[PDB]
Scaffold this active site. Structure first.
Site, PDB file in Angstrom:
ATOM      1  N   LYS A   1      49.021  26.986  15.548  1.00  0.00           N
ATOM      2  CA  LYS A   1      47.767  26.282  15.299  1.00  0.00           C
ATOM      3  C   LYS A   1      47.245  26.691  13.933  1.00  0.00           C
ATOM      4  CE  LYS A   1      47.353  25.577  20.020  1.00  0.00           C
ATOM      5  NZ  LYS A   1      46.470  26.037  21.125  1.00  0.00           N
TER       6      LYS A   1
ATOM      7  N   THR B   1      40.181  29.507  30.133  1.00  0.00           N
ATOM      8  CA  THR B   1      39.967  30.031  31.473  1.00  0.00           C
ATOM      9  C   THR B   1      40.633  29.086  32.460  1.00  0.00           C
ATOM     10  OG1 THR B   1      37.787  28.962  31.490  1.00  0.00           O
ATOM     11  CG2 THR B   1      37.855  31.324  31.025  1.00  0.00           C
TER      12      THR B   1
ATOM     13  N   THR C   1      33.984  28.338  29.656  1.00  0.00           N
ATOM     14  CA  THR C   1      33.479  28.028  30.988  1.00  0.00           C
ATOM     15  C   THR C   1      33.931  29.113  31.958  1.00  0.00           C
ATOM     16  OG1 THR C   1      33.658  25.654  30.511  1.00  0.00           O
ATOM     17  CG2 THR C   1      33.341  26.302  32.812  1.00  0.00           C
TER      18      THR C   1
ATOM     19  N   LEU D   1      30.585  19.348  25.679  1.00  0.00           N
ATOM     20  CA  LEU D   1      31.150  18.178  25.009  1.00  0.00           C
ATOM     21  C   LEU D   1      32.235  17.471  25.819  1.00  0.00           C
ATOM     22  CD1 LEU D   1      34.102  19.325  23.662  1.00  0.00           C
ATOM     23  CD2 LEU D   1      32.378  20.652  22.422  1.00  0.00           C
TER      24      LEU D   1
ATOM     25  N   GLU E   1      35.676  15.471  25.572  1.00  0.00           N
ATOM     26  CA  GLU E   1      36.757  15.269  24.625  1.00  0.00           C
ATOM     27  C   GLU E   1      36.814  13.772  24.304  1.00  0.00           C
ATOM     28  OE1 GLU E   1      40.054  16.653  26.828  1.00  0.00           O
ATOM     29  OE2 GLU E   1      39.599  18.789  26.586  1.00  0.00           O
TER      30      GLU E   1
ATOM     31  N   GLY F   1      36.802   4.539  39.442  1.00  0.00           N
ATOM     32  CA  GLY F   1      38.056   4.926  38.822  1.00  0.00           C
ATOM     33  C   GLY F   1      39.119   5.367  39.810  1.00  0.00           C
TER      34      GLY F   1
ATOM     35  N   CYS G   1      38.899  20.435  31.570  1.00  0.00           N
ATOM     36  CA  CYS G   1      37.659  21.046  32.037  1.00  0.00           C
ATOM     37  C   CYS G   1      37.403  20.874  33.536  1.00  0.00           C
ATOM     38  CB  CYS G   1      36.475  20.501  31.223  1.00  0.00           C
ATOM     39  SG  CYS G   1      35.130  21.674  30.921  1.00  0.00           S
TER      40      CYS G   1
ATOM     41  N   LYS H   1      39.396  22.021  37.797  1.00  0.00           N
ATOM     42  CA  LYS H   1      39.560  23.448  38.057  1.00  0.00           C
ATOM     43  C   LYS H   1      38.195  24.128  38.150  1.00  0.00           C
ATOM     44  CE  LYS H   1      39.495  25.055  33.461  1.00  0.00           C
ATOM     45  NZ  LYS H   1      38.422  25.851  34.121  1.00  0.00           N
TER      46      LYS H   1
ATOM     47  N   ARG I   1      46.429  17.127  30.181  1.00  0.00           N
ATOM     48  CA  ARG I   1      46.282  18.209  31.152  1.00  0.00           C
ATOM     49  C   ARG I   1      45.498  17.772  32.385  1.00  0.00           C
ATOM     50  NH1 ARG I   1      48.593  22.383  33.718  1.00  0.00           N
ATOM     51  NH2 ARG I   1      46.982  23.052  35.210  1.00  0.00           N
TER      52      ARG I   1
HETATM   53  N1  LIG Z   1      38.543  21.158  26.868  1.00  0.00           N
HETATM   54  C1  LIG Z   1      37.189  20.811  27.205  1.00  0.00           C
HETATM   55  O1  LIG Z   1      36.882  19.634  27.315  1.00  0.00           O
HETATM   56  C2  LIG Z   1      36.129  21.867  27.430  1.00  0.00           C
HETATM   57  C3  LIG Z   1      34.755  21.536  27.399  1.00  0.00           C
HETATM   58  C4  LIG Z   1      33.779  22.532  27.611  1.00  0.00           C
HETATM   59  C5  LIG Z   1      34.167  23.846  27.854  1.00  0.00           C
HETATM   60  N2  LIG Z   1      35.539  24.180  27.887  1.00  0.00           N
HETATM   61  C6  LIG Z   1      35.965  25.536  28.139  1.00  0.00           C
HETATM   62  O2  LIG Z   1      36.272  26.202  26.939  1.00  0.00           O
HETATM   63  C7  LIG Z   1      37.377  27.039  27.165  1.00  0.00           C
HETATM   64  C8  LIG Z   1      38.544  26.696  26.257  1.00  0.00           C
HETATM   65  O3  LIG Z   1      38.693  25.309  26.200  1.00  0.00           O
HETATM   66  P1  LIG Z   1      40.013  24.694  25.609  1.00  0.00           P
HETATM   67  O4  LIG Z   1      40.162  23.252  25.988  1.00  0.00           O
HETATM   68  O5  LIG Z   1      39.954  24.601  24.117  1.00  0.00           O
HETATM   69  O6  LIG Z   1      41.251  25.544  26.080  1.00  0.00           O
HETATM   70  P2  LIG Z   1      42.511  25.640  25.160  1.00  0.00           P
HETATM   71  O7  LIG Z   1      43.701  26.227  25.970  1.00  0.00           O
HETATM   72  O8  LIG Z   1      42.898  24.213  24.673  1.00  0.00           O
HETATM   73  O9  LIG Z   1      42.160  26.547  23.918  1.00  0.00           O
HETATM   74  C9  LIG Z   1      42.040  27.928  24.068  1.00  0.00           C
HETATM   75  C10 LIG Z   1      42.650  28.601  22.844  1.00  0.00           C
HETATM   76  O10 LIG Z   1      42.172  29.927  22.694  1.00  0.00           O
HETATM   77  C11 LIG Z   1      43.286  30.680  22.256  1.00  0.00           C
HETATM   78  N3  LIG Z   1      43.185  32.068  22.702  1.00  0.00           N
HETATM   79  C12 LIG Z   1      43.368  32.537  23.987  1.00  0.00           C
HETATM   80  N4  LIG Z   1      43.196  33.873  24.012  1.00  0.00           N
HETATM   81  C13 LIG Z   1      42.892  34.331  22.732  1.00  0.00           C
HETATM   82  C14 LIG Z   1      42.621  35.580  22.183  1.00  0.00           C
HETATM   83  N5  LIG Z   1      42.625  36.750  23.022  1.00  0.00           N
HETATM   84  N6  LIG Z   1      42.356  35.694  20.870  1.00  0.00           N
HETATM   85  C15 LIG Z   1      42.344  34.614  20.053  1.00  0.00           C
HETATM   86  N7  LIG Z   1      42.605  33.369  20.559  1.00  0.00           N
HETATM   87  C16 LIG Z   1      42.877  33.199  21.872  1.00  0.00           C
HETATM   88  C17 LIG Z   1      44.536  30.016  22.733  1.00  0.00           C
HETATM   89  O11 LIG Z   1      45.556  30.151  21.820  1.00  0.00           O
HETATM   90  C18 LIG Z   1      44.146  28.607  22.895  1.00  0.00           C
HETATM   91  O12 LIG Z   1      44.691  27.824  21.889  1.00  0.00           O
HETATM   92  C19 LIG Z   1      37.721  26.958  28.627  1.00  0.00           C
HETATM   93  O13 LIG Z   1      37.173  27.978  29.368  1.00  0.00           O
HETATM   94  C20 LIG Z   1      37.163  25.630  29.012  1.00  0.00           C
HETATM   95  O14 LIG Z   1      36.839  25.546  30.349  1.00  0.00           O
HETATM   96  C21 LIG Z   1      36.516  23.175  27.673  1.00  0.00           C
END
Ligand SMILES: NC(=O)c1ccc[n+]([C@@H]2O[C@H](COP(=O)([O-])OP(=O)(O)OC[C@H]3O[C@@H](n4cnc5c(N)ncnc54)[C@H](O)[C@@H]3O)[C@@H](O)[C@H]2O)c1
Ligand SMILES: NC(=O)c1ccc[n+]([C@@H]2O[C@H](COP(=O)([O-])OP(=O)(O)OC[C@H]3O[C@@H](n4cnc5c(N)ncnc54)[C@H](O)[C@@H]3O)[C@@H](O)[C@H]2O)c1
Lengths: 429, 429
Positions: free
Chosen positions: B37, B88, B124, B155, B157, B251, B258, B261, B326
């Site tokens: 990344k 998470t 989250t 937010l 996506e 739907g 998000c 889970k 996902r």
């Molecule tokens: N995707 C969504 O729509 C959304 C919306 C609101 C909240 N969230 C929450 O935010 C969190 C992450 O979301 P996400 O979609 O981007 O997950 P994600 O897997 O797409 O991104 C998480 C990233 O953090 C990195 N990471 C993990 N451990 C690390 C560490 N110790 N040090 C540095 N980097 C590290 C990983 O490489 C990964 O790319 C989750 O808990 C999720 O529930 C997600």
């Protein structure tokens, strides 16, 4: 315009609907086969409590657009449109919708029928009822040119006039443009009106009344969790509330004439039509169990042993600003406390004489401050706004034990801390 | 103002959050221990699809407020506030929240720690996590003067920037006014900001994401009923939609990184804290069963025997305008069709290379019109708006059988009647 209207039924709905129709300038006749209501309205005494109704009828009595009877046919004499506002209670036994009163009334209409009138199911009925009536009309008065509609009603008791006067929306279900133009011509004094098909429009009233109960019971379930992890559900409800897809408040559950059965009929009608409705199936199952458990919440607050103690209750109905004790939460809350051997002061401003017929062994009072007088605890159940501004400091001196259970989360706990009271709300650290 | 910020994590959130923070004029460092990344962002190629992000980073790269690394400590060097945006995911096994990545990261922060920074859980997470971190901070860097907050993120996506730029609200959970004044000073360029306690703020993100899934799965259950009684769920959703306590559309279910889970973790966290959450407990149980059944809806539409036939799919993700496959509904819909022996053309504008790793045996294409080319049926799953304006008349000539299944109810059936197609939406007479 200003046309002839017969409201078959003069209960909580048929009264308020028909009266407001007269304020639109329509010629209105309200019918009920109970005499006492009609022999109370003719005395100009409203049977039930709805704000604004006192004048609204008594006004339109004098201007002469509003009439009362128990003779059906006098009303159905040349009526432009005929409304059915009769009861659809739960069938004792299964839980399904007792459509007999409708089917009685729709029939008794069909014979006493001069002109091609327009038949409007306003009663919260299951779906295809309007199709089944359409048979009965054709069975009885085939060439009478009549059409059958559903226009359900959405008013909250305690705000019925304003709900009716300012609707979010109003629903009409038919496909025959004649009747469409009629119901238009009826409701035209407001300026939207939603025109769906019949069965669709029948489904909406249930779906909405289901969905609200889902929303209430959801945050209630959340509120239980907010207790055990020390959150604060008022903030949480606000937390999601600022979403545009949300204004919801934790409670000891829901009830009333309309709600808990319309769930059950919908749950039932889904079953006969072979689909599950798991979410609403869960929704009552929590709710029945909830208000009982709210009673156990009190006992826990009261130490655990409530044999022979004494308990004050504030509020009795399911709702402030009416008398409709029909399926209140409070009865379940009382009966829980009685089952652990206790004793029950209870104040409601306007519920009592209706509440007495549903309640064993209950000392009602005249005054909310008297409900606590030498009790072991006081419970607030229904938020009559008079409660919102009361002297907390009399009550600490009025109690054998300084124990208060807010259940509609009105009183900020700092006040109860100030008066040294045992604070217990819904969803509290 | 314009302060130093470290976003530990640079996935779907950490990228978009940190980038927008740089647009506020804050000094921003995004960290990720994946190299690819960071070795894509340094090449100025965004890994994932989010509208507006292409410029937003590449802009703030040049103005020099936005930086990338895989070294943690370079970012935590004198950072005013440190954000945790790591994953998470569901713990394989039970379903609970895999808080290891956080607990790894929060620790690795705590050592590489110059100033009294401010720790912000944005991931989250379940509740009291911020309390558990508060131990770890005290375990590792006791006298370092640091404070621990939760500011969750809301937010969608496919609208992340606009969601972030214009929030309904933003949530902050602490009781220490120092950190309160900091997070204020961060978010000040918008002008509301909601200040609750920690565990409360942790609970909100789950409660909301639960509640939306409830709303979706509710009307979906209704939509099933609308089929069997011949209602029309678009009208019905509008029917309740005009209420001020409602904007919801039927739907084949929900999904995404998000949602499904966060339900499950909340369902779990409630169980450990000994309360049931029956409504949400029902909600997934329908939803898992639903999208599979949507596959059976197709088979019923396709006569019943789909051994050896051929099926076109439009849309693949759980959502238009991103690539996040996902937990899509579609995988379950595909796997259903494969289990009755069939074959699967599939178009998605931007999902494919991510979708391929989750999918066996699936001929992807280049073009939506090519997905139908000699299929027995075409299914629309995800409403990429490009689909909303397509030629229906090519497709009737492109099919071995004139069978279309709209599942997001976009196409008005008159068009499919016009092109003589077999109409099948969600909740239709
Ligand atoms: N995707 C969504 O729509 C959304 C919306 C609101 C909240 N969230 C929450 O935010 C969190 C992450 O979301 P996400 O979609 O981007 O997950 P994600 O897997 O797409 O991104 C998480 C990233 O953090 C990195 N990471 C993990 N451990 C690390 C560490 N110790 N040090 C540095 N980097 C590290 C990983 O490489 C990964 O790319 C989750 O808990 C999720 O529930 C997600
Ligand atoms: N109470 C509410 O808040 C509410 C709101 C919306 C819709 N509804 C629906 O409207 C209907 C009635 O509501 P309600 O609260 O007034 O019930 P209700 O029992 O209070 O009133 C019904 C009245 O109709 C009369 N009636 C019954 N059969 C009759 C007949 N054959 N001829 C003439 N009169 C007859 C009864 O005497 C009774 O007084 C129900 O189906 C209910 O679900 C109620």
């Amino acid at each position: 315009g200003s046309v002839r209207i017969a409201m078959i039924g003069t209960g909580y709905v048929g009264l308020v609907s028909g009266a407001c129709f007269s304020d639109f300038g329509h010629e209105v006749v309200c019918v009920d086969k109970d005499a006492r209501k009609i022999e109370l309205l003719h005395q100009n005494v409203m049977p039930i409590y709805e704000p604004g109704l006192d004048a609204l009828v008594a006004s339109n009595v004098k201007a002469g657009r509003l009439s009362f009877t128990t003779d059906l046919a006098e009303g159905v004499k040349d009526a432009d449109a005929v409304f059915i506002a009769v009861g659809t209670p739960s069938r004792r036994g299964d839980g399904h919708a007792d459509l007999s009163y409708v089917f009685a009334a729709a029939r008794e209409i069909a014979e006493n029928l001069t002109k091609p009138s327009v038949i409007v199911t306003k009663s919260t009925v299951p779906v295809g009822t309007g199709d089944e009536v359409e048979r009965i009309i054709a069975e009885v008065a085939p060439n009478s040119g009549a059409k059958v509609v559903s226009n359900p009603e959405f008013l909250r008791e305690g705000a019925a006039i304003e709900d009716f006067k300012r609707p979010d929306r109003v629903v009409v279900g038919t496909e025959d443009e004649f009747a469409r133009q009629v119901m238009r011509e009826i409701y035209r004094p407001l300026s939207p009106v939603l025109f769906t098909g019949r069965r669709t429009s029948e489904l909406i009233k249930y779906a909405a009344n289901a969905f609200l109960a889902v929303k209430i019971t959801f945050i209630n379930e959340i509120a239980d969790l907010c207790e055990q992890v020390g959150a604060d559900v008022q903030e949480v409800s606000r937390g999601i509330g600022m979403d545009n897809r949300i204004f919801l408040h934790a409670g000891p559950g829901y009830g009333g004439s309309c709600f808990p059965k319309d769930t059950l009929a919908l749950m039932k009608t889904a079953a006969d039509n072979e689909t599950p409705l798991r979410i609403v199936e869960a929704t009552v199952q929590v709710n029945d169990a909830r208000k009982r458990a709210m009673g156990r919440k009190v006992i826990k607050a009261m130490g655990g042993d409530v044999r022979g103690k004494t308990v004050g209750i504030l509020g009795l109905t399911f709702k402030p600003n009416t008398d409709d004790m029909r399926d209140a939460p409070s009865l379940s809350i009382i009966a829980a406390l009685q089952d652990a051997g206790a004793t029950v002061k209870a104040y409601d401003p306007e519920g009592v004489e209706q509440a007495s017929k549903m309640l064993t062994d209950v000392e009602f009072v005249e005054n909310p401050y008297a409900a606590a007088d030498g009790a072991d605890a006081l419970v607030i159940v229904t938020e009559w706004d008079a409660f919102r501004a009361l002297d907390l400091t009399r009550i600490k001196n009025s109690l054998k034990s300084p124990v208060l259970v807010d259940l509609r989360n009105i009183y900020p706990p700092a006040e109860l801390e100030r008066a040294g009271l045992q604070y217990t709300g819904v969803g509290k650290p």
